[PDB]
Structures are given as C-alpha cells and as structure tokens.
Design an enzyme around this catalytic site. Structure first.
Site, mmCIF file in Angstrom:
data_model
loop_
_atom_site.group_PDB
_atom_site.id
_atom_site.type_symbol
_atom_site.label_atom_id
_atom_site.label_comp_id
_atom_site.label_asym_id
_atom_site.label_seq_id
_atom_site.Cartn_x
_atom_site.Cartn_y
_atom_site.Cartn_z
ATOM 1 N N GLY A 182 62.281 48.199 33.394
ATOM 2 C CA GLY A 182 61.108 47.359 33.556
ATOM 3 C C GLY A 182 60.894 46.881 34.977
ATOM 4 O O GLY A 182 59.751 46.766 35.425
ATOM 5 N N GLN A 239 57.370 47.959 23.474
ATOM 6 C CA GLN A 239 57.188 47.219 22.229
ATOM 7 C C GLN A 239 55.956 46.324 22.279
ATOM 8 O O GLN A 239 55.289 46.134 21.256
ATOM 9 C CB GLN A 239 58.453 46.424 21.910
ATOM 10 C CG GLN A 239 59.585 47.348 21.480
ATOM 11 C CD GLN A 239 60.874 46.633 21.129
ATOM 12 O OE1 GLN A 239 61.776 47.233 20.546
ATOM 13 N NE2 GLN A 239 60.977 45.360 21.491
ATOM 14 N N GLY A 293 66.360 46.871 33.700
ATOM 15 C CA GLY A 293 66.540 47.769 34.829
ATOM 16 C C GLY A 293 65.419 48.781 34.965
ATOM 17 O O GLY A 293 65.029 49.137 36.081
ATOM 18 N N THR A 297 69.061 39.426 27.918
ATOM 19 C CA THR A 297 70.145 40.349 27.592
ATOM 20 C C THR A 297 71.009 40.697 28.799
ATOM 21 O O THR A 297 71.888 41.561 28.688
ATOM 22 C CB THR A 297 69.585 41.632 26.965
ATOM 23 O OG1 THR A 297 68.572 42.188 27.815
ATOM 24 C CG2 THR A 297 68.989 41.341 25.593
ATOM 25 N N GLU A 301 69.329 39.292 35.473
ATOM 26 C CA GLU A 301 67.868 39.315 35.410
ATOM 27 C C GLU A 301 67.202 38.574 36.571
ATOM 28 O O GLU A 301 66.180 39.078 37.068
ATOM 29 C CB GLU A 301 67.380 38.795 34.046
ATOM 30 C CG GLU A 301 67.741 39.739 32.882
ATOM 31 C CD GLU A 301 66.953 39.502 31.590
ATOM 32 O OE1 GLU A 301 65.772 39.108 31.651
ATOM 33 O OE2 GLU A 301 67.523 39.736 30.498
ATOM 34 N N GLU A 342 34.945 40.691 37.264
ATOM 35 C CA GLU A 342 34.159 39.572 37.761
ATOM 36 C C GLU A 342 34.971 38.279 37.734
ATOM 37 O O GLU A 342 34.847 37.445 38.639
ATOM 38 C CB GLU A 342 32.878 39.451 36.936
ATOM 39 C CG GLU A 342 31.856 38.518 37.515
ATOM 40 C CD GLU A 342 30.508 38.680 36.860
ATOM 41 O OE1 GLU A 342 29.973 39.809 36.879
ATOM 42 O OE2 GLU A 342 29.989 37.681 36.313
ATOM 43 N N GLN A 371 61.702 48.847 27.368
ATOM 44 C CA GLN A 371 61.658 48.327 26.006
ATOM 45 C C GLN A 371 60.555 47.285 25.839
ATOM 46 O O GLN A 371 59.698 47.420 24.960
ATOM 47 C CB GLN A 371 63.014 47.743 25.611
ATOM 48 C CG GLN A 371 62.996 47.122 24.225
ATOM 49 C CD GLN A 371 64.336 46.560 23.809
ATOM 50 O OE1 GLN A 371 64.444 45.384 23.479
ATOM 51 N NE2 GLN A 371 65.367 47.400 23.817
HETATM 52 N N1 LIG Z 1 58.457 39.473 24.995
HETATM 53 C C1 LIG Z 1 59.296 40.496 24.899
HETATM 54 N N2 LIG Z 1 60.369 40.585 25.754
HETATM 55 C C2 LIG Z 1 61.235 41.624 25.646
HETATM 56 C C3 LIG Z 1 61.057 42.612 24.683
HETATM 57 N N3 LIG Z 1 62.066 43.510 24.820
HETATM 58 C C4 LIG Z 1 62.867 43.113 25.842
HETATM 59 N N4 LIG Z 1 62.369 41.935 26.351
HETATM 60 C C5 LIG Z 1 62.884 41.153 27.494
HETATM 61 O O1 LIG Z 1 63.013 42.034 28.601
HETATM 62 C C6 LIG Z 1 64.205 41.764 29.311
HETATM 63 C C7 LIG Z 1 65.125 42.971 29.224
HETATM 64 O O2 LIG Z 1 64.395 44.082 29.676
HETATM 65 P P1 LIG Z 1 64.156 45.410 28.797
HETATM 66 O O3 LIG Z 1 62.682 45.745 28.740
HETATM 67 O O4 LIG Z 1 64.758 45.310 27.417
HETATM 68 O O5 LIG Z 1 65.032 46.474 29.645
HETATM 69 P P2 LIG Z 1 64.527 47.942 30.081
HETATM 70 O O6 LIG Z 1 63.201 47.873 30.799
HETATM 71 O O7 LIG Z 1 64.469 48.860 28.881
HETATM 72 O O8 LIG Z 1 65.595 48.439 31.187
HETATM 73 P P3 LIG Z 1 67.054 49.050 30.829
HETATM 74 O O9 LIG Z 1 67.289 49.026 29.335
HETATM 75 O O10 LIG Z 1 68.091 48.238 31.581
HETATM 76 O O11 LIG Z 1 67.103 50.487 31.334
HETATM 77 C C8 LIG Z 1 64.818 40.540 28.677
HETATM 78 O O12 LIG Z 1 64.255 39.455 29.372
HETATM 79 C C9 LIG Z 1 64.265 40.560 27.276
HETATM 80 O O13 LIG Z 1 64.154 39.256 26.775
HETATM 81 C C10 LIG Z 1 59.969 42.523 23.819
HETATM 82 O O14 LIG Z 1 59.775 43.379 22.952
HETATM 83 N N5 LIG Z 1 59.098 41.459 23.935
HETATM 84 MG MG LIG Z 2 66.103 49.692 27.705
#
Ligand SMILES: Nc1nc2c(ncn2[C@@H]2O[C@H](COP(=O)(O)OP(=O)(O)OP(=O)(O)O)[C@@H](O)[C@H]2O)c(=O)[nH]1
Ligand SMILES: [Mg+2]
Ligand SMILES: Nc1nc2c(ncn2[C@@H]2O[C@H](COP(=O)(O)OP(=O)(O)O)[C@@H](O)[C@H]2O)c(=O)[nH]1
Ligand SMILES: [Ca+2]
Ligand SMILES: [Mg+2]
Lengths: 439, 58, 421
Positions: free
Chosen positions: A146, A15, A144, A179, A183, A254, A11
């Site tokens: 990410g 995003q 998870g 979330t 983490e 560089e 996510q």
């Molecule tokens: N800056 C920023 N942080 C984000 C965003 N979306 C999620 N996060 C952060 O990312 C973490 C959660 O990871 P996600 O990327 O939502 O989870 P995922 O990679 O989709 O993994 P799973 O849903 O568990 O399969 C938390 O620390 C959130 O605050 C975003 O759009 N921008």
């Molecule tokens: Mg997700």
C-alpha cells in the site's frame, strides 16, 4: 468522455475496492454478472455511469478498475466471490510474495518485478477511454504494498500520463487494527514520495472509522467489513458527481478548485452524516438541517483532528437524496451562527452540490437506508494534527534507528528517512503558514 | 502555451530521472548488502578448512 | 503457496520435532498415514505451510531429520506418526558427536552436512514460494548445537534472502546431560547471533521449574518438559498455520519483533499451565515464561500475543490495553504500539481457550548471563579444552564466542536504559 480509472493497491485498497464497486453496482442497478437492464444502449454509450463502467457487446458493464497486490490471498477472494464475473481476469493482478510491511520491498525489491505488468494493464484501460480524466488510487499508508508499491506506481503514472489528475484514498494507520509496528515509517515514506505526484488525497483514519462504527452503529468490535462499507459510502458521495447527472450536480473537479489553494495543501477533511443503525432510524427521519449540523461535529470526521482549533480554507457540502437548496441555505445560516473561522485570504462561502439520486445500502449491512445524506469536504489546517501524531511516532523509533535495518537491508539509505521526515516537517510548517493572518 | 508544454515535459523528465536514479542506487545497495553477507559466510568456510587442517597436523 | 521447510537435528531436536508434528497434525486433522480426516475447512486452508500434498491426497510433512547417530531417529520412525515422514528425508550418521560442538560443527558434522543440503534443495526446489526454514535443536549437545549452527550457515549461503528461524533449547544444570554444555551453548549463541533472524529460547531451566513448582512433578522427565515445548511450539506457529492477518508469515513476524538484527531472541510464554482477564494476566507472569527470566527485571522491546478459542474480541482488546496501561513501565516508550494481538478460533487439543506469548524483552540477558557465568567458570581454568582443540579449534575462537555473547548482553542493557526524551 471524462472516464475515471480506479487503482486498488494492497489488501486495504483491494478490500475497499470490493465495497465500493459492490455499492456502485447497487446504485446503478448493475447485477453481479455486469448486466444492467435499464441500460438500453448496448455495447457503449455516453451516460454518466460510463465514467466508471465500460460496456461490452454482450451487455456487460465492466469496472474501469485495476486490482494489484503483491500476494494473491486477497484478490483470489475477488476471483471467486460474488462479483467475479464483473471483472476481466487481466484487471486482477497478483504476485506471490508480499512486501512484509516493508516500504522498500513494495517500492523496490518485490514491486519492481510487477510494475511493468501493472502499467501495461492500466494502459489497456486508458486506451478504451475517449477522454480520460484521471486516476483514483486506493491504498493503505501502513502496509508494504500500500505504501511502497503505490509510491512507485504514482511516480510511474506521472511519467506515462503527465499531469493528468491523480486522486488518492489513503488509509491512515490506527493501533486498533494495525498489523505492523513500522507503519509510521511506511506512512512518512509514501507521503513524501507521492506528495508531488498527487493532486488531491482523501485520508481515512481507521481509528475515526472504528469509533464511528462503535458509537453510531453499536458494533462492539468492528471488522474491516464494517469499516469498508462505511468508507465506501464516503467514496460514493465524493464520486457521485462523476457517476450521476443532475441540474444541481457540481462536478468533483469544481470542488477541487476550491479545495487546493497550493499544490502541497491538498488533503481535504471529509465528514459524513448520517451514520445511524436501522433500529435508531426507524420512525426518526433526519432532516437537511440535522445532517448538516452533524458535519461540524468532530466525532463524524474521517480523520481525528479538531477543526475548531484550526482555520478553514474551503468548505464544500455534497448532498445526496431528497434535498432542495432552500433547506440547505436555511441549515447553513443556522450553522454560521451556532458554530467556523476562515483564513483572511479566502472567501467564507460554502460551496454546495446536490445529487438527487438517493443513498443506497448493501444488503445485510449495519447502515440504515436514509432518504438524504451529506459529505462535507473541508480544507482545514487542523488536518495537520494527523501529520504531527504520525511524525511523533516516526521520531521516537528513528532516534534509536529501530527497525531501520529491515529497510537498509533491502537497499534503502538512512538519507531517505531523514529526507522524508524533513519533507513532513516542511509540510507541517506549510499548514501553519497558510493559517497566519496577512500583513 | 510553449511554457506550459515545457513545464509539463520538465516534470516528466525530472520524475523519470529521479526514479531511475533511485532504482539504480537501490539495486547496488541491496547487492552490496548481499555480497557482504556471502563474503562473511565464505570466510567462515575458510576458517572451517583451517580447523580441519590444524587437526590433520596433530 | 508460502512454504516452511522444517529441520530437526540431534537428539533433542528430533524429540521435540516429533512432538511438534504430532500436535499440529492433530490440529490439522492428519492421521499417522498422511490422510485428512478433519471437520473444518480452516485446517486445510494453509496446510501447505508445513505439509506437501502427494499421491492419494496424502499430506507429507516438509521435514528433514538429521543426527550423527541413528539412535534417536530409529525411535521416531517407530513412534506415533513415524510412517508419515518421508523416508528419504532421514539423514543420519554413525560416528556421533559425543556432546562435542567442534565435532558437530567442524569434523563429524561437516562430513554429513552435504547430504543434508541435498535434501534441503530437493524440498526447497518444489516450493511455490519458500518462506524460510525452522530448526529444532539443543544448544548444549553436539549434533544439534554444532551441526545445527553449521547447517544454518550453509543454508544461508544458498538462501540468503530467506528467513532463518530456530527453536533453540538452552542447557540447564537441572537437566544436565554433560558438563561441557556451557561451552556448547556459548559457541552456538556466537553463531545464532549472526546467522538467524528469530530464535525462540526454550530454556530447560524454565521448563523444569514449571513442571516441578507449577505442574507439581517431583521428578520431571524429558517427556514432561517436551509437553510444554509442544504446547509452546503449537502456539507460536498458530499465526503461520491458520488464516489470519497478523504475523501470518515468518518475515512479517521478524519485521514486527526484531528492532535490531542481533536482538532476535524471544521469550516464549503459555497459559494456562478460565476467563480472558485471568488468561491475559497469567500470560504476562514470569512463572508462565519458557525462559528463566523475570520480565519485570527488564523492558519489552516488542511482544506478540496469540489467543486461541472462542471468546470476546472486545474483551481481549480491553484486557490487552489494560495490561499495557497498568504496566507501561515495562514497555519501551521509543517503540509505540509494540504489542500486537492475534486471535484464532481453533483452540489447542484439550483446552477451551489458551494464550501464547512471544516476547523480545531485555530481561533475556539473565539467560545469557547465566550461560556466560557457567562458561567463564570453566574457561578461566582451561577445563575440558582438549575436546575442542583436538578437533582443530583454538582458544581464540572460545574467547571470541565469549566476547560476542557478552556484547549481546551489553546491547540488551543499552536499550533497557534508553529513554525517549
Ligand atoms: N480500513 C481498512 N484498513 C485496512 C484494510 N486492510 C488492511 N488495512 C490497514 O492497512 C494497514 C496494513 O496494510 P495492508 O493493506 O494490509 O498491507 P499491504 O498493502 O497488503 O502490504 P503488504 O501485505 O505488507 O505487502 C493496517 O493499517 C491495516 O489496519 C481494510 O480492508 N480496510
Ligand atoms: Mg498484503
Ligand atoms: N527439553 C528437552 N531437552 C532435551 C531433550 N533431549 C536433550 N535435551 C537437552 O539437550 C542437551 C543435550 O543435547 P543433545 O540433543 O543430547 O545433543 P545432540 O544429540 O548431539 O544434539 C541437554 O542439555 C539436555 O537438557 C528433550 O527431549 N527435551
Ligand atoms: Ca449503454
Ligand atoms: Mg544426549
């Protein structure tokens, strides 16, 4: 030549990828349908923006990007959003069941079912490149996918592409938008696994971006959209040397030579200025000296830490817009007196780059459109404070084995927790050793 | 240049082997975890058969 | 895409299960004929979590109605939203359980369990991506407690990698239907400790005290108690039914709430029973808990807070930080950031704004100690043991259930006295 492939995982990665690619299109005059009227060479070309965009015969400029998530909710918004015609459908890869904030599910249980398809789709982009330079992987530490899937992907990229450069944009977890309680676990695990597979990682602390939106933009409760539009400005400053050309333009690689003195010490601190609302930018032009002085104000850093209590091993300034070297040198001379301690084994100079292409803002955003901007990339021992805070939260939970059963139940062993934590302990010790004076 | 080639290939080899080691170790652990769960549920089924048999002998 | 299969077993389970479907159908704009007459697209975005889409744009609840007697289920088919359930998903017996756990678990319930599993597989086979199951039942009865824990075990054999959630109604002498209830509750806890991932403890003693003391009902009925259950069940499932990113599915909720596999019994809370500070304060008060436990007698392992309605997210963020700082002693230090907050824009029916509280507190041992005290007050004199040994059980299985629930309390006490340094 010198193409760059971006990989947006999970996510946060996806995003942020939306924010970055929208910003890129605005900077290069590319429309939501991929058409670029200023581009006269149809079907291809060797322009600077081609490092990030390929061209079709029908005049479409296609991001060299792959969006991967283990659930479809976030990428479906790309498939139906404003820039849906920008991406070929095979660049947007989704699964059905996410990793449930569990590193083990992203690296093993769920991630092993899609990793071959992702690598196949990355191979299709790489085959279009005449001289692939490397990858940019965008992901969160805390999720998870990410964390787990990114580690699995980075390991597999090292195999399929050797020592080809891999840069990371990593979202460091903040409680204001976190979330998941686990983490800290996911963060330590992915950092340990990726450390030997990454050449350079730019950490973005969500709490630092959160405070900047609250303090400088007067946003009461910033959303991901607020954070991501700010993050994309820093990402744009870092990649601008790859996507634009200029006489005073210094290639990112560089800067990378100066930023990475040892393979494991590869975590630059990023600082961006100016971050200012339209209301405050009206009739208040920020000069080269003002934005340069804001780079050394710790409240403008992408990671919460205190460089004043650390030592510098490198300082890079990446200017964009109406900036000439005469002003930069003057601004730097002022800062060298009023502010900066280097380790004894490193030269104290500042490495400067200037892209004359002026900054861009996304319509309807909160950032004012300024005439000049700057991103400072510094290599300071103080960034290890972010590892310490994360390692302290790990230790609190792991000493009671809290939540560890969710990981063991997916096939992981306690030995991987202790092995990852000991790597972080050595990493913290490495940042101490590089700061000690020579004998 | 031969040393540079050998170092790059050894890095690729070590990474490919460590990953296959981890993916195989993880597959066995998760399967063992699921096999122990089913065995406990199947022992609860055997206990249910003995309860219905004990009532039949009354 | 992420579907939940709902199961209601026994008298209590079908009663609170019907009330649950009436409330969420109203929130999602579903009439008793299965048609959508809503006004917001946010109602249908995640409608597939609890509803199947049929011919004629109908929405049929993914629910399975189980009981060993047709009495309670016949009233469901005649009550409101009775025609919205799938007629084939009614699986009822005739002999009944007679408030006997052994009858629901081993004899009468085991004869019917296979016909329920046939409906479970049919609903699960059409799921794009099955999340898991949720069961509504009582622990003091026979069908809900006995055949409920049996169904849990049998479903876990065919779906071992799915989440098992239960809304379990704890027995209380203040609403006592029989006397062998402490036996049925202890035998059910023995099963729920091993085969469920997360269990909401809907304590009847707490529901009565809320209706009597707070709601000023001198003679509370089962309908008064179930109105609290419906408002509670609607709250804890808000994050599953509406678009969001915090505890949006059953597994992410378990990962956030369950630090140790056995300690998965949650204390539900609702407010009101009006500003954001007052709504937050009442949400953490012992008088708003759906379990007869004082949270200030233990410590919080994890907490999920859900706010519903239009309000200031900046104010909610400050008030949730405020309550944690002023009450830091009641949150374990070795789990940082163990309180997560979700906000939904759609309030429940008839309220400008509400709050729902899900807590994993070590003070839940007060509930398990009360049931263990009522259990040992009967087991030490072998009272009413012929109801169970007659079906094939033995005293060994009663002692094992007693020892396992006493271990649950010891484990909750272990982490209550645990410190960081
Ligand atoms: N800056 C920023 N942080 C984000 C965003 N979306 C999620 N996060 C952060 O990312 C973490 C959660 O990871 P996600 O990327 O939502 O989870 P995922 O990679 O989709 O993994 P799973 O849903 O568990 O399969 C938390 O620390 C959130 O605050 C975003 O759009 N921008
Ligand atoms: Mg997700
Ligand atoms: N809150 C609530 N509790 C109930 C209801 N019906 C029964 N109970 C409780 O459930 C227990 C009896 O279980 P019951 O459902 O009748 O047994 P079963 O039909 O064999 O599953 C008693 O302790 C009651 O307090 C109800 O409608 N609401
Ligand atoms: Ca061209
Ligand atoms: Mg009854």
């Amino acid at each position: 030549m010198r193409e760059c492939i971006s990989i947006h995982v999970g996510q946060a990665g996806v995003q942020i990828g939306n924010a970055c690619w929208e910003l890129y299109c605005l900077e290069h005059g590319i429309q939501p349908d991929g058409q670029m009227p200023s581009d006269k060479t149809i079907g291809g070309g060797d322009d600077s923006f081609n490092t990030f965009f390929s061209e079709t015969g029908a005049g479409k400029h296609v991001p060299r990007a792959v969006f991967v998530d283990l659930e479809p909710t976030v990428i479906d918004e790309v498939r139906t959003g404003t820039y849906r015609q920008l991406f070929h459908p095979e660049q947007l890869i989704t699964g059905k069941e996410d990793a449930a904030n569990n590193y083990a599910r992203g690296h093993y249980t769920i991630g092993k079912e899609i990793i071959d398809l992702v690598l196949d789709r990355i191979r299709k982009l790489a085959d279009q490149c005449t001289g692939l330079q490397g990858f940019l992987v965008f992901h969160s530490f805390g999720g998870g996918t990410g964390s787990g899937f990114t580690s699995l992907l980075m390991e597999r990229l090292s195999v399929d592409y050797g020592k080809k450069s891999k840069l990371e944009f990593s979202i460091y977890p903040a409680p204001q938008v976190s979330t998941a309680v686990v983490e800290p676990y996911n963060s330590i695990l992915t950092t340990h696994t990726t450390l030997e597979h990454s050449d350079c990682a730019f950490m973005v602390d969500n709490e630092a971006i959160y405070d900047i939106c609250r303090r400088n933009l007067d946003i009461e409760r910033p959303t991901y959209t607020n954070l991501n539009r700010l993050i994309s400005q820093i990402v744009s400053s870092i990649t601008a040397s790859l996507r634009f050309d200029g006489a005073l333009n210094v290639d990112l690689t560089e800067f990378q030579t100066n930023l990475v003195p040892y393979p494991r010490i590869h975590f630059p601190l990023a600082t961006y200025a100016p971050v200012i609302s339209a209301e405050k930018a009206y009739h208040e032009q920020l000069s080269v000296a003002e934005i340069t002085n804001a780079c050394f104000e710790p409240a403008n850093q992408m990671v919460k830490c205190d460089p004043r209590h650390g030592k510098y091993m490198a300082c890079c300034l990446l200017y964009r817009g109406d900036v000439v070297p005469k002003d930069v040198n003057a601004a730097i001379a002022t800062i060298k007196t009023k502010r900066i301690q280097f380790v004894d084994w490193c030269p104290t100079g500042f490495k400067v780059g200037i892209n004359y292409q002026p900054p861009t803002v996304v319509p309807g955003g909160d950032l004012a459109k300024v005439q000049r901007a700057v991103c400072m990339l510094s290599n300071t021992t103080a960034i290890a404070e972010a590892w310490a805070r994360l390692d302290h939260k790990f230790d609190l939970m792991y000493a009671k084995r809290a939540f560890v059963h969710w990981y063991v139940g997916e096939g992981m062993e306690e030995g991987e927790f202790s092995e990852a934590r000991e790597d972080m302990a050595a990493l913290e010790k490495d940042y101490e050793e590089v700061g000690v004076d020579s004998v | 240049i031969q040393k540079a080639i050998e170092e790059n290939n050894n890095f690729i080899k070590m990474a490919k082997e460590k990953l296959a080691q981890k993916m195989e170790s993880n597959k066995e652990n998760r399967e063992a975890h699921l096999a122990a769960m089913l065995e406990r549920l199947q022992e609860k089924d055997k206990h249910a058969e003995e309860v219905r048999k004990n009532k039949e002998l009354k | 895409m992420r579907e939940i299969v709902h199961i209601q077993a026994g008298q209590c389970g079908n009663q609170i299960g019907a009330k649950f479907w009436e409330v969420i159908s109203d929130e999602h704009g579903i009439d008793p004929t299965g048609s959508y007459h809503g006004d917001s697209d946010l109602q249908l975005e995640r409608i597939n979590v609890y509803y199947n889409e049929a011919t004629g744009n109908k929405y049929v609840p993914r629910a399975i109605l189980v009981d060993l007697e047709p009495g309670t289920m016949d009233s469901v088919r005649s009550g409101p939203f009775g025609q919205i359930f799938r007629p084939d998903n009614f699986v009822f017996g005739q002999s009944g359980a007679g408030n006997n756990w052994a009858k629901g678990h081993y004899t009468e319930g085991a004869e019917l369990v296979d016909s329920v599993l046939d409906v479970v597989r049919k609903e699960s086979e059409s799921c794009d991506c099955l999340q898991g199951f949720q069961l509504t039942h009582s622990l003091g009865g026979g069908t809900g407690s006995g055949m409920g824990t049996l169904l849990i075990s049998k479903i876990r054999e065919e779906y071992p990698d799915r989440i098992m959630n239960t809304f379990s109604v704890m027995p209380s002498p203040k609403v006592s239907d029989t006397v062998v209830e402490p036996y049925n509750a202890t035998l059910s806890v023995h099963q729920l400790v091993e085969n469920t991932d997360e269990t909401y403890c809907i304590d009847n003693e707490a529901l009565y005290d809320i209706c009597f003391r707070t709601l000023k009902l001198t003679t509370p009925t089962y309908g008064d108690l179930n109105h609290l259950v419906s408002a509670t069940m609607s709250g804890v499932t808000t994050c599953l039914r509406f678009p969001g990113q915090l505890n949006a599915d059953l597994r992410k909720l378990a990962v956030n709430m369950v630090p140790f596999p056995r300690l998965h019994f949650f204390m539900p809370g609702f407010a009101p029973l009006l500003t954001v500070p007052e709504l937050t304060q009442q949400m953490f008060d012992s008088k708003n808990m759906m379990a007869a436990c004082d949270p200030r007698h233990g410590r919080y392992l994890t907490v999920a807070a859900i706010f519903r309605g239009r309000m200031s997210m900046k104010e909610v963020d400050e008030q949730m930080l405020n309550v944690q700082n002023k009450n830091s002693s009641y949150f374990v230090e070795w789990i940082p950031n163990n309180v997560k907050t979700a906000v939904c824009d759609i309030p429940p029916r008839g309220l400008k704004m509400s709050a729902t509280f899900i807590g994993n507190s070590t003070a839940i041992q007060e509930l398990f100690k009360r049931i263990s005290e009522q259990f040992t007050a009967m087991f030490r004199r072998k009272a009413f043991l012929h109801w169970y040994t007659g079906e094939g059980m033995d005293e060994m299985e009663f002692t094992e259930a007693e020892s396992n629930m006493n271990d649950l309390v010891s484990e909750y006490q272990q982490y209550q006295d645990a410190t960081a340094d």
